Enzyme design. Structure first.
Site, PDB file in Angstrom:
ATOM      1  N   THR G  29      -1.334   6.671   3.562  1.00 50.92           N
ATOM      2  CA  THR G  29      -1.551   7.875   2.721  1.00 50.92           C
ATOM      3  C   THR G  29      -0.578   8.891   3.042  1.00 50.92           C
ATOM      4  O   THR G  29       0.022   8.940   4.111  1.00 50.92           O
ATOM      5  CB  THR G  29      -2.956   8.347   2.754  1.00 50.92           C
ATOM      6  N   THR G  30      -0.269   9.682   2.039  1.00 48.96           N
ATOM      7  CA  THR G  30       0.653  10.859   2.187  1.00 48.96           C
ATOM      8  C   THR G  30      -0.135  11.839   3.087  1.00 48.96           C
ATOM      9  O   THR G  30      -1.332  12.126   2.817  1.00 48.96           O
ATOM     10  CB  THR G  30       1.043  11.501   0.923  1.00 48.96           C
TER      11      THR G  30
END
Lengths: 231, 244, 244, 251, 204, 241, 242, 249
Positions: G29-30
């Site tokens: 995930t960012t």
């Protein structure tokens, strides 16, 4: 076996293949589907006999009076987690005059598995639990993967033919969440969900197992004449 | 991992026998000759040093004969370095018995204790053993003079005469064809020397590559006297028997 | 291999080590067990391989306690460890509560013991690198479920069974168990039914030197039937095949 | 160290156990025959080797108790550990429980030493099979048990283990009948001499006999004594061959 | 009781001219009861002499304790231990059980074989070197002994003049001492020859 | 093949495994130049700041051990943090049990011993970093002792480390031929810093900014790093020369 | 190959087993980190895999001490254990010195732990990058922690798929404010670069989480961004990228 | 867990033990050192060679003091010598300086360190030290003595010996040059003349480390008025002292 019989190495794709392999242990087990609204949580497990003269294997373990866990993988691996979840639940009652919560208990259990999978001569465990309970914050239903991943949902499933159950639950989503304070309907909606986890094996009173806890309801395991109601 | 790098050398082969016990016998044949013959007035232990060299001091050397206790000394055939760990266990052990029972150690307990230690090292751990074979000259008051050879996995077996070390098969045969049960220390000295001489790994048998030790009951007060000869007393007897 | 681990995976999702154990219940001697509500009958093939073997002090029946019996099939070196632990568990329960232990609870304890392979999983002591290779037929009588008969695998999983057969002849034996068992059976019709199923998978001839009965009853405890009675029952079975 | 040296094998075997049974074939031979009034364990003594002072050679039959004897086959290095452990056990049972050991008591203990290292990791088991024989105290029932490297034990009326054990067992079927053992001490003794003179050979030197009788009596019968018994066996054998030649001529 | 007043004991030792002498009594009691008029409290490893005083059990306990350590030294290094090297050894050994100790007073006496000098030394229960080239006395009548031995002593004594001063000093303390007397034995220790001679005295 | 995979002697009497540590300090592109003054020990080193989004004042290669001995680390920074923790502890331990701060010589021997046990242990990886300790003690004077992962150390008049340290070694060597002494002579500490910077600009051919140097100077009874503000005075003052 | 353990090494200065473990974070995930004058603003993309999921009810931001938010990307169970480990070390600092743990100090302690698993054969290293910071008496800080037990100071960080996209936007934002911005204002910019970095996860849909430790608003303690304040941040990002 | 508790030294099939031969290879690719026993001292001697031209070598002690009367010197690896010189010093203090409060015999000391070597070829986490040592010494109970420790953890007494990569040249050199008695003065002139053909460069006193365990020195005793305590028999020779002996050839 350069990384495939080794519970200590990485694993050129950022994985470990052993965690993917422990997930086939769930496939070889049976199925259990859980759903919660906000005022009740429900586990509905499919039990499995070993032949017609053999009894059926219980797939719902009571941990507490406000907690229960269900397995859908290997039974000796489910015996470790069960012991541990029960110890920490009684500790909560004794020391802080508190009840234990599912969310918090998901994290204690996460870290327990992790540090055995870190070790060599360890394993990533051959089971998945869904742990329900009704605590101080309401219902919670968490899904425990062999990886240890905890996510909080309104409906989930583990085992074989679980994808078909989750199809059931994506439809009935807003139906079951808005039944609140009528425990009957939730429980009957987990019977039908798991009827989409069948191969047309049907459901008898000795294949169907329900256990529920509500706000105003104990953790109680239903079997026999008390699951024929909900069909 | 950690299992990857494992020896697995303390298990058996399909022969029902360890890889390490067999390896150890090869190296005990590399090592210099040590022989025991049992006279009726003593035990002759005679050891030929494994090395000899021009500038090497073999005149402060006692690199094959070691006193475990006053009435029990050994000849060594194998690795010298390896033999020294077991030597100081045997010293402790002997004194511990003397310490508690106020009596000198029988030979029987002493040999067996060292057999066990070799046995643990082959049993478990992935550990190597101490591939040494001891020839024990010992006296006890419950069986007279007693003689023993020990093997790399720790086993003891009785003898009247035996040879371990370099050119063991050839040596051992000269000892069998000559042996009489009535032999005294004087005869036993000469036989041991002649046998060493026909199996030498140089071109002769000389005082500077010889160690000689005897245990005599002809000594004062009819007691057992351990005498580990100086190289000049080894030189003296060598000239009497006419090799030099 | 994927058994050269201690708890490794194994692309199938299950151990290797466990699968082999289950094919070493095919090194067993057939133990058949018919559970009824008038008692549980255990019959075992003792196996006589020599006429120089003393075979009447060989039984595959073992007493846990008076109100709990067990019959073992498979590799029996593994089984000494499992039956010893169960004898203590039963005795511990009567120590702490002065009470008769559930057959269900006892079976569960011996499953808890069965999981011990690993050297880095969980949070307990590991004194095995491998699983067991033997299965149990735990019968007993408790006052909450009545008579019970449980089949424990060396996996660490257990089922209550009305009738099970494990051993070398387990596949063909269970095939008859499915058809001939009913709930209208009693202690004695169950008892001659065992000897019928055992008879096919017998490899000598049905005789009182290769076959042993035992029951567990509430009112008498654990009673291992004497050879005279065991021999009688063998004869009255054959007379109902003489009645065909 | 906790790395496995005993693992489940893919045949439903243990590796170490096949290897251990082979270490017992390559070793010494102990034959066990039980009377009606004694037990007798004769074992092959190595004394094939030339130049051996036998007073100091460790015997291959070792008394653990005043009325319980222990014999063995396989690796001799490994065997001392079972004998050393058994002696401590005999005396531990007198210490804490009262009474000497029973035969049954030692039969399960020795089986548990061999078993433990089989199942356990980081340990291999010994190459040793043993004969535990003797009497129980305040009893006079001859007990003959055999323990093996697996952790398994069994009772026997007559048995043999070690080298050319097949040959010995085949002789003993027709000459040892389960119903009537030999009723006298000499005939029991003599049956074990007859088996031993097949494989061991070479006089009475390499032959050993130990007799144990009821009420604590262990006597060791020397080579010399055994020679007397050979000579009777040789005349009995030779004479019986002669009267077979005469019947065969006629028929 | 006291662990140090339970069987008495005194060891005297004096130096002379090219010789030493050590001597003890023979009285071994268990409290007030006399058990034996025989027991040496003197021992010897090679040419060093150990008199050990105090406590009954600790005479034996320390004696086989030094039996072990003397062995190790002789077998490794192939010589018999020196008086001075023995004194250091004893110092360190006594100190090992600091708390709850060894209950003894050893006295070290020899004549060196590397230079041929008399050497004497003393110790308490805890142990500290008490160097002299006079005399070392220890025990329970050690007090009595300190006065009496001084009165007699002359630096340098002929080996049988030496014998007159120690015999007299020991007997007189020991026949005013409750737990000690009952016979006495004096060793005159020459470089290569020891005579062990008993003394006739009061056995009362 | 196991003498390049864990620590056992090859048939050539060597340990390539040991070797592989020295080749790792050269992937991080840091060079250092360390000179003994007359009243100081100077150590100057590269810093790399390649992003706006890295903070310059946080990033460091000069780690302060004792209050007399600084430590300049050439090679991978995880192993740096482990060694700084262990080196400070050991200096503190010596202060605690001996009542004076560990000499440089001896700090070098303690880490050297520890580095040799990690290359003796086969379930333990040695340090991959090359550690220079610089100080001014009044037990020894200006000092440089450079420990390495092999477990070998020696004192030095001067030293350089990094991939390009053969160019720095040539400049420094010539400087002690001409002077005719084993240390720089000057009575200002500031100027000893400046000679060191001159010889580095010459050796590598590259001129430095204030945020690509991190300068450590040990004067008498204190070790300090110069801030980027002070480094800029020095780099203007090299032109004035 | 040189990945059989971690007491193997190649002459290359690389080790392969450790390199592989960053590849797990690279599909993560960012998660971003913006360093501000008053504080720090953390934000993390939480993927919405299904509609069964409850949005904003599981967080990847677990608080450490009272004033260090820690948020991680890579292997979620593994990262949760590493963050668990640094809470025991934070309680030990408060018991022992009676003061909250410094950010540079907490950063040091974590580095040691993760360093260790790359020395001993018998443990499996960590495969997470953690994004953490807070406000103490050494000032506001921001630190990113590699699977190799490395940290440095940071004025922008990112980890996940969209780590490229995020960094490129953070550079134009330090050229926007080369004298830095508020932690209150960085709420609105945290969302923006998540929107821009959700064009590497535009196969999926997201839920926005933001948390802060700011000196200016919450009295230097780490608390959550939620309610109407979160929705200003949602609206800010929305109107710009459209 | 740990599992590194298996041996890293094991037997070869056709005899010997392969691991201790590999360690000795590090000695015959090492630095070279030699020892001549006189009847009035021992000289031991070695070569220093630099790692950089800006390195020092008077900051390095290739000859080190174990106790005032017994010194040691290595061939082989440096690292391996650093750690082992400390273990020898430590065991010389626990076992004769707490127990007899004096300096140990030289025969005994050599034995004790050989035990450390022997138990370093045993169990995991340890493979042997890459040095062979000379432990030259004097005690008063066995006189002068010379030993060579092998990585076997074996020892041999010698009358004069050498170790290092010129071992083969050196003991042959010493065969003509050594004699039954030797003066100490002349032993120094023999030892340099041998080490002269075994260095490939510099041969000054700042490159040659020379130490004698000759005769006692009451100036390095550091106290006086005790005549029962002799001065240190070891004396390291400073560079100027060695330069003189260079001119005596």
């Amino acid at each position: 076996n350069n990384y495939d019989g080794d519970t200590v190495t990485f694993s050129p794709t950022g994985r470990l293949f052993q965690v993917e392999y422990a997930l086939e242990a769930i496939k070889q087990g049976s199925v259990t589907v859980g759903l919660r609204s906000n005022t009740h949580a429900v586990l509905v497990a499919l039990k499995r006999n070993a032949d017609e003269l053999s009894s059926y294997q219980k797939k719902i373990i009571k941990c507490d009076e406000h907690m229960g866990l269900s397995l859908a993988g290997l039974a000796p691996d489910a015996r470790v987690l069960s012991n541990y979840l029960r110890q920490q639940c009684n500790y909560s009652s004794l020391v802080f005059n508190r009840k234990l919560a599912v969310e918090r208990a998901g994290h204690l259990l996460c870290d327990k598995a992790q540090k055995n999978t870190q070790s060599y001569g360890g394993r990533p465990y051959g089971v998945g639990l869904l742990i329900i309970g009704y605590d101080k914050s309401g219902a919670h239903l968490l899904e425990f993967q062999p990886s240890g991943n905890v996510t909080e949902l309104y409906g989930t499933a583990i085992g074989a033919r679980s994808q078909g159950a989750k199809t059931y639950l994506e439809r009935t989503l807003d139906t079951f969440i808005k039944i609140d304070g009528n425990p009957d309907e939730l429980i009957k909606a987990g019977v039908e969900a798991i009827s989409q986890s069948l191969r047309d094996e049907s459901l008898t009173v000795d294949n169907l197992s329900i256990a529920i806890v509500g706000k105003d309801t104990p953790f109680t395991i239903y079997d026999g004449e008390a699951v024929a109601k909900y069909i | 991992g950690s299992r990857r790098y494992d020896s697995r050398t303390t298990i058996f082969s399909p022969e029902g026998r360890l890889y390490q016990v067999e390896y150890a016998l090869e190296s005990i044949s590399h090592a210099g000759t040590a022989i025991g013959i049992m006279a009726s007035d003593g035990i002759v232990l005679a050891a030929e040093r494994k090395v000899t060299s021009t500038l090497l001091e073999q005149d402060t050397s006692t690199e094959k004969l070691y006193k475990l206790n006053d009435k029990i000394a050994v000849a060594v055939a194998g690795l010298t370095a390896d033999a020294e760990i077991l030597i100081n266990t045997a010293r402790i052990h002997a004194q511990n018995y003397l310490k508690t029972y106020n009596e000198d150690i029988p030979v029987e307990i002493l040999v067996r204790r060292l057999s066990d230690i070799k046995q643990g090292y082959t049993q478990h751990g992935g550990l190597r053993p101490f591939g040494v074979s001891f020839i024990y000259a010992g006296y006890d008051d419950r069986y007279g003079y007693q003689l023993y050879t020990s093997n790399p996995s720790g086993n003891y077996t009785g003898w009247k005469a035996i040879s371990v070390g370099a050119n063991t098969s050839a040596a051992q045969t000269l000892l069998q064809m000559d042996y009489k049960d009535d032999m005294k220390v004087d005869d036993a000295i000469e036989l041991a020397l002649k046998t060493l001489s026909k199996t030498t790994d140089s071109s002769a048998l000389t005082y500077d590559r010889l160690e000689f030790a005897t245990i005599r009951k002809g000594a004062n007060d009819g007691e057992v006297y351990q005498k580990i000869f100086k190289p000049q007393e080894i030189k003296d007897i060598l000239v009497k028997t006419g090799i030099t | 291999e994927y058994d050269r681990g201690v708890s490794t995976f194994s692309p199938e999702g299950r151990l290797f080590q466990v699968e082999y154990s289950l094919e070493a219940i095919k090194l067993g001697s057939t133990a058949i067990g018919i559970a009824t509500k008038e008692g549980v009958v255990l019959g075992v093939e003792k196996r006589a391989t020599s006429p120089l073997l003393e075979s009447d002090s060989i039984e595959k029946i073992v007493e846990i306690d008076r109100h709990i019996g067990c019959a073992m099939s498979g590799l029996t070196a593994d089984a000494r460890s499992m039956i010893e632990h169960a004898r203590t568990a039963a005795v511990t329960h009567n120590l702490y509560y002065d009470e008769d232990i559930n057959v269900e609870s006892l079976t569960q304890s011996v499953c808890d013991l069965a999981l011990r392979f690993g050297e880095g999983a969980s949070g307990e002591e590991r004194l095995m690198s491998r699983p067991f290779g033997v299965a149990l037929l735990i019968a007993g009588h408790d006052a909450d479920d009545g008579y019970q008969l449980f089949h424990a695998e060396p996996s660490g999983t257990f089922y209550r069974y009305n009738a099970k057969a494990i051993g070398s002849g387990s596949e063909g034996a269970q095939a008859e168990l499915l058809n001939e068992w009913h709930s209208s059976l009693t202690l004695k019709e169950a008892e001659l039914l065992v000897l019928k199923i055992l008879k096919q998978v017998m490899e000598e001839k049905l005789d009182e030197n290769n076959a042993q009965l035992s029951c567990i009853t509430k009112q008498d405890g654990f009673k291992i039937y004497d050879n005279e009675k065991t021999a009688e029952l063998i004869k009255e079975l054959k007379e109902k095949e003489a009645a065909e | 160290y906790d790395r496995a040296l005993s693992i489940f094998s893919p045949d439903g075997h243990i590796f170490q156990v096949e290897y251990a049974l082979e270490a017992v074939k390559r070793g010494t031979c102990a034959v066990g025959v039980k009377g009606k009034n004694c037990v007798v364990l004769g074992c092959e003594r190595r004394s094939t080797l030339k130049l051996q002072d036998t007073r100091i050679t460790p015997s291959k039959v070792s008394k653990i108790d005043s009325h319980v004897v222990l014999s063995f086959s396989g690796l001799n290095a490994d065997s001392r550990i079972l004998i050393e452990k058994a002696r401590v056990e005999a005396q531990s049972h007198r210490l804490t429980l009262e009474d000497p050991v029973t035969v049954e008591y030692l039969t399960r203990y020795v089986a548990g030493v061999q078993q433990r290292y089989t199942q356990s990791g980081g340990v291999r088991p010994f190459g040793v099979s043993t004969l535990i024989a003797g009497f129980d105290p305040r009893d006079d029932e001859p007990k003959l048990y055999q323990t093996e490297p697996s952790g398994i034990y069994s009772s026997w009326s007559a048995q043999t283990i070690g080298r050319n054990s097949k040959t010995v067992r085949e002789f003993l079927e027709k000459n040892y009948d389960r119903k009537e053992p030999p009723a006298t001490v000499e005939e029991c003794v003599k049956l074990t001499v007859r088996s031993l003179l097949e494989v061991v050979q070479t006089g009475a030197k390499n032959i050993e006999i130990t007799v144990v009788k009821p009420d604590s009596d262990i006597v060791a019968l020397s080579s010399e004594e055994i020679n007397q018994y050979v000579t009777q066996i040789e005349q009995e054998k030779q004479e019986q061959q002669e009267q077979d030649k005469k019947k065969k001529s006629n028929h | 009781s006291d662990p140090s007043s339970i069987n008495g004991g005194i060891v005297v030792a004096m130096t002379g001219k090219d010789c030493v002498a050590i001597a003890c009594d023979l009285r071994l009691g268990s409290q007030s009861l006399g058990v034996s008029n025989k027991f040496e409290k003197i021992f010897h490893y090679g040419h060093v002499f150990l008199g050990i005083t105090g406590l009954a059990t600790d005479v034996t306990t320390l004696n086989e304790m030094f039996r072990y350590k003397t062995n190790l030294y002789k077998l490794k290094e192939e010589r018999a231990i020196e008086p001075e090297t023995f004194t250091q050894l004893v110092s360190s050994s006594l100190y090992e059980r600091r708390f709850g100790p060894y209950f003894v007073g050893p006295v070290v006496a020899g004549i060196n074989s590397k230079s041929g000098k008399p050497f004497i030394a003393g110790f308490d229960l805890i142990g500290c070197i008490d160097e002299a080239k006079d005399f070392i006395v220890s025990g329970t009548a050690s007090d009595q002994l300190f006065g009496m031995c001084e009165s007699l002593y002359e630096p340098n004594l002929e080996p049988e003049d030496l014998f007159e001063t120690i015999s007299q000093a020991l007997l007189n303390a020991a026949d005013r001492d409750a737990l000690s007397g009952w016979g006495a034995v004096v060793y005159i220790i020459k470089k290569d020859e020891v005579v062990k001679r008993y003394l006739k005295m009061r056995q009362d | 093949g196991y003498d390049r995979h864990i620590t056992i002697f090859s048939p050539e009497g060597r340990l390539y495994q040991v070797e592989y540590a020295f080749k790792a300090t050269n992937q991080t592109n840091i060079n250092s130049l360390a000179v003994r003054g007359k009243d100081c020990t100077v150590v100057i080193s590269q810093k790399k700041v390649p992003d706006k989004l890295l903070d310059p004042t946080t990033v460091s290669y000069i780690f302060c051990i004792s209050r007399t001995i600084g430590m300049v680390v050439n090679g991978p920074i995880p192993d740096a943090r482990n060694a700084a923790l262990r080196a400070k502890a050991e200096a503190a331990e010596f202060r605690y049990k001996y009542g004076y701060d560990m000499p440089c010589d001896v700090l070098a021997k303690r880490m050297a011993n520890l580095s040799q046990i990690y290359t003796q242990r086969a379930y333990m990886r040695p340090l991959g970093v090359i550690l220079t300790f610089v100080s001014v003690d009044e037990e020894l004077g200006p000092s440089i002792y450079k420990t390495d992962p092999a477990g070998y150390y020696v004192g030095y008049k001067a030293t350089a480390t990094g991939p390009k340290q053969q160019e720095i070694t040539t400049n420094l060597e010539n400087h002690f031929k001409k002077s005719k002494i084993d240390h720089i002579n000057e009575e200002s500490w500031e100027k000893v810093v400046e000679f060191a910077i001159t010889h580095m600009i010459d050796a590598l051919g590259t001129e430095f900014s204030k945020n690509d140097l991190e300068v450590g100077v040990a004067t008498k009874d204190k070790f300090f790093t110069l801030s980027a503000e002070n480094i800029e005075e020095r780099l203007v003052a090299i032109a004035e020369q | 190959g040189y990945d059989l353990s971690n007491s193997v090494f190649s002459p290359d200065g690389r080790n392969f087993q450790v390199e592989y473990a960053v590849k797990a974070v690279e599909n993560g995930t960012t998660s971003i980190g913006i360093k501000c004058n008053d504080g720090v603003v953390f934000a993390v993309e939480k993927l919405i895999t299904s509609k069964l999921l409850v949005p904003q009810k599981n967080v990847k931001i677990q608080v450490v001490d009272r004033h260090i938010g820690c948020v991680y990307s890579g292997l979620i169970p593994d990262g949760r254990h590493l963050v668990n480990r640094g809470r025991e070390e934070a309680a030990s600092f408060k018991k022992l010195y009676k003061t909250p743990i410094p950010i540079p100090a907490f950063a040091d302690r974590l580095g040691q732990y993760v360093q260790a698993h790359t020395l001993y054969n018998s443990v499996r290293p960590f495969g997470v990058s953690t994004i953490f910071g807070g406000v103490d008496k050494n000032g506001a800080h921001l630190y990113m922690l590699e699977p190799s037990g490395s940290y440095w100071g940071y004025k922008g960080a990112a980890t996940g798929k969209g780590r490229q996209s995020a960094k490129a936007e953070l550079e134009k934002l330090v050229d926007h404010h080369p004298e830095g911005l508020s932690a209150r204002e960085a709420v609105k910019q945290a969302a923006k670069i998540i929107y821009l970095a959700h064009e590497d996860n535009k196969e999926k849909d997201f839920e926005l989480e933001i948390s802060w430790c700011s000196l200016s608003e919450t009295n230097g303690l780490h608390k959550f961004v939620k309610g109407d304040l979160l929705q200003e941040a949602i609206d800010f990002a929305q109107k710009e990228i459209n | 867990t740990d599992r590194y508790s298996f041996s890293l030294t094991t037997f070869s099939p056709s005899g010997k033990l392969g691991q201790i031969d590999y360690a000795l290879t590090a000695v015959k690719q090492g630095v070279t050192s030699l020892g001549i026993k006189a009847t009035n001292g021992v000289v031991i001697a070695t070569e220093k060679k630099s790692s950089s031209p800006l390195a020092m070598s008077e900051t390095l002690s290739k000859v080190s003091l174990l106790t005032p009367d017994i010194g040691a010197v290595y061939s082989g690896m440096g690292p391996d010598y650093r750690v082992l010189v400390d273990k020898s010093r430590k065991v010389a203090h626990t076992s004769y300086k707490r127990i007899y409060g004096e300096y140990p015999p030289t025969k005994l000391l050599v034995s004790e360190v050989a035990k450390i070597m022997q138990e370093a070829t045993q169990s995991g986490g340890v493979r042997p030290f890459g040095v062979s040592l000379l432990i030259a010494g004097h005690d008063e109970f066995n006189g002068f003595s010379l030993y060579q420790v092998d990585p076997s953890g074996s020892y041999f007494p010698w009358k004069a010996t050498a170790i290092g990569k010129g071992s083969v040249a050196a003991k042959t050199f010493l065969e003509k040059r050594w004699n039954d008695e030797l003066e100490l003065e002349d032993a120094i002139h023999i030892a340099l003349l041998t080490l002269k053909e075994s260095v490939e460069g510099e041969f000054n006193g700042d490159t040659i480390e020379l130490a004698i365990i000759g005769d006692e020195n009451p100036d390095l005793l550091g106290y006086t008025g005790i005549p029962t305590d002799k001065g240190p028999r070891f004396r390291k020779l400073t560079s100027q002292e060695i330069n003189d002996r260079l001119e005596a050839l």
